[PDB]
Amino acid sequence: SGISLDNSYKMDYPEMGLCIIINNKNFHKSTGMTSRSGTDVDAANLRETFRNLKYEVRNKNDLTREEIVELMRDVSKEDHSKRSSFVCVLLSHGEEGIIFGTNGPVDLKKITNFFRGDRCRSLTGKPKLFIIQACRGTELDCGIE
Amino acid sequence: HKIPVEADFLYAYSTAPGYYSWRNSKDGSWFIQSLCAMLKQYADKLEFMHILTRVNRKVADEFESFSFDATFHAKKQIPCIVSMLTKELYFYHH
């Protein structure tokens, strides 16, 4: 064939891939974390938006830290050979490097490590997108007119 | 050839390192509101980093906190695109 360029990810596999949405609204009382009013609007918006991009959306609500880790592990062990990409959206409380399960924190590295090129071979070379709505600390941006 | 185990990840953070992130109890979070709007408008048109740059602009320009607490009032937010991608990403093909 003619000249070929290799500058863009192959996105014409049979499936776009999974879009996992973790929507943590209600937290165990003992954590002291507030209920994240408005997060259901986000989760619905994301579901519709990624639906129209032809992702296979899975919405999960109010997962413990243990459930988050097991969900990610299980998803990373699926066969993604026929999928172009992978998307995970995390909606929760957070701190720098950390997302909260309903009962306590999860290191973000623990979640993303399941999808490393050496640990999820059917996603090697494919884009893995992590979209994170969560605090990264307590600084406030005062802005400038 | 090998590829790095951290290659081909993109982290679309709602806020800059060290900062709070803002969520409106009625409308949803500033970042997710803006992300969905920009994907709806531009996913058939723009490469993903350029979509996310429009999201940065929308969050930066169109939102400012309102609070009865002076500590939390009139505050701004910028999201933070972290890319280890090795190719351009378009959600469309052909």
Partner: peptide, 4 residues
């Protein structure tokens, strides 16, 4: 407006 709330914080996360």
């Amino acid at each position: 407006d709330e914080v996360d």
